[PDB]
């Protein structure tokens, strides 16, 4: 239960962590995850929530997700406070174990902040109506948990095991490590969305996860842009050397770092396409050949098998309405040259892949019709009336 004093206590602890990090003796880099920016940003969003719930503090206080988040915020802030207390001088040692823990805790605050903004957009609770990107993933969460925002790990593990069986406790604990971003032993709808975006398609979820995050030597998990260039510097004279990682700023998305014919160390983003599709493409035309400089590259052919696109039938209501316009439902309304063959997830807006690519090339990952973030895409076919 979240009261007035509990929130005030959290902020006082948050302030102490800021004071400890403000020390010029640490000389920490401004690059994300930057805790000196993350904690003050967490204070403002919480303040935004409270102003949206002024008077309605009974509804906010008894809210399960908010209770859990606040409990985890105090715990993570106190953990950082103790980290500075135990081994004070080790905080200034560049690559020491306590310093690596501060970088790990900073990542957690970044995930925690993105989760809070995802569940409470504009300060109002939208967790019960959270839009899961992939359709098959959304149907799993609805049938197993309904409109629940957060569920305990053991409850998530038993539901998942029914659809995608888990081989061992070793696999379950590795699976827990990748999906539980906030490190609180609970799995949120936001965390689920991220895992199901990265390890798509849903139909072979654990196979994709095992082949890309467990058995793949190229998997580096969360890594900053600079660290990718720093790790690939060892393999400058080995053309085809590559690595793939996650970004705290671009949650749910992948990023590949490779060495060219000359070197230079280039970094690309596949954007809403399955990672193995880009890795297989990248291997057959000699770009991604050596994962983490190793001679042996994993064969991912078993994951990529030509599948049919989802079909959408236009109704009588839609046909009649489009006839008045002097057009069809299936025609792309941006170019008016092709039929709609791609669906933006989760808004559902349709256009041709051509208009999408051009929009993404210049404007970014935002829907042309409603400005909603392009969390994912799906190729589709619109069957005329």
């Amino acid at each position: 239960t979240v009261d007035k004093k509990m929130v005030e206590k959290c902020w006082k602890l948050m302030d102490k962590v800021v004071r400890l990090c403000q020390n010029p003796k640490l000389a920490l880099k401004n690059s994300p995850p930057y805790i000196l920016d993350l904690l003050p940003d967490t204070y403002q969003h919480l303040r935004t929530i409270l102003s949206r719930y002024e008077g309605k503090m009974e509804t906010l206080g008894e809210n399960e997700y908010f209770r859990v988040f606040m409990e985890n915020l105090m715990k993570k802030t106190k953990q950082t406070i103790s980290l500075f207390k135990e081994g004070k001088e080790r905080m200034y040692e560049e690559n020491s174990q306590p310093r690596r823990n501060l970088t790990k805790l900073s990542l957690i605050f970044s995930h925690m902040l993105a989760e809070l903004k995802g569940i409470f957009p504009s300060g109002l609770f939208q967790g019960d109506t959270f839009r899961i990107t992939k359709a098959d993933a959304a149907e799993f969460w609805r049938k197993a948990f309904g409109e629940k925002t957060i569920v305990p790990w053991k409850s998530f593990r038993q539901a998942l095991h029914e659809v995608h069986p888990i081989s061992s406790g070793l696999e379950a604990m590795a699976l827990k490590s990748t999906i539980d971003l906030t490190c609180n032993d609970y799995i949120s709808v936001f965390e689920f969305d991220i895992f199901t975006r990265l390890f798509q398609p849903w139909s072979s979820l654990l196979r994709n996860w095992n082949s890309l995050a467990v058995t793949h030597p190229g998997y580096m998990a969360f890594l900053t842009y600079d660290e990718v260039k720093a790790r690939l510097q060892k393999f400058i004279h080995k053309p085809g050397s590559y690595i793939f990682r996650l970004s705290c700023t671009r949650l749910g998305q992948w990023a590949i770092g490779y060495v060219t014919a000359d070197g230079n160390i280039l970094q690309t983003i596949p954007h809403n396409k399955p990672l193995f599709q880009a890795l297989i493409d990248g291997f057959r035309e000699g770009f991604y050949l050596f994962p983490d400089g190793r001679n042996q590259n994993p064969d991912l052919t078993g994951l990529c098998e030509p599948t049919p696109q989802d079909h959408i039938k236009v109704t009588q209501e839609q046909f009649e309405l489009y006839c008045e316009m002097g057009s069809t439902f299936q025609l792309c309304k941006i170019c008016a040259e092709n039929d709609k063959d791609v669906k933006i997830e989760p808004c559902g807006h349709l256009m041709c892949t051509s208009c999408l690519t051009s929009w993404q090339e210049s404007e970014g990952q935002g829907c042309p019709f409603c400005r909603c973030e392009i969390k994912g895409t799906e190729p589709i076919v619109v069957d005329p009336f």
Binding site: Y258, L266, Q267, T268, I269, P270, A278, G282, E285, F287
Partner: peptide, 7 residues
């Protein structure tokens, strides 16, 4: 931010 297109 300066990334790189897909090869």
């Amino acid at each position: 931010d300066g990334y790189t297109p897909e090869p």
